[PDB]
Amino acid sequence: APKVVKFSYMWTINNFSFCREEMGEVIKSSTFSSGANDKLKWCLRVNPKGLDEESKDYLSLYLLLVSCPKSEVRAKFKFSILNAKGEETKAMESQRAYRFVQGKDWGFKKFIRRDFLLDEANGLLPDDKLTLFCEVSVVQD
């Protein structure tokens, strides 16, 4: 029986329209963890303008294992955008658990097309803020 710990983190990126124009910008959340108290620290990482040429039309979104003194940790994850009413939308999940090590991320290079994000009718940048919600399910050996 795998032993699984569920935790989550909400991140608001303020002043989204002030992200850098040149490609390559990385923005990261504060670190977060489960209560399991095992020295693991995670964060979210966003490339507002894509990771590379093929993905330049998208925002990329990754889960990063920032600190981990053990060889490896397996975890499932899910990311959602919170809309102008506070509800989850446009979520995508990893489906299976991915193997993290310290400094490794897993996520979605093409999380959402930027033109959809920047279309006010979709209500995803209210007050120039992008709010993302990450749910993680980590396997505890």
Binding site: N47, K90, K104, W106, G107, F108, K109, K110, R113, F116
Partner: peptide, 11 residues
């Protein structure tokens, strides 16, 4: 182009 691509990768 797809609005979202559910392919998981590592940066």
């Amino acid at each position: 182009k797809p609005l979202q691509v559910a392919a998981v990768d590592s940066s």
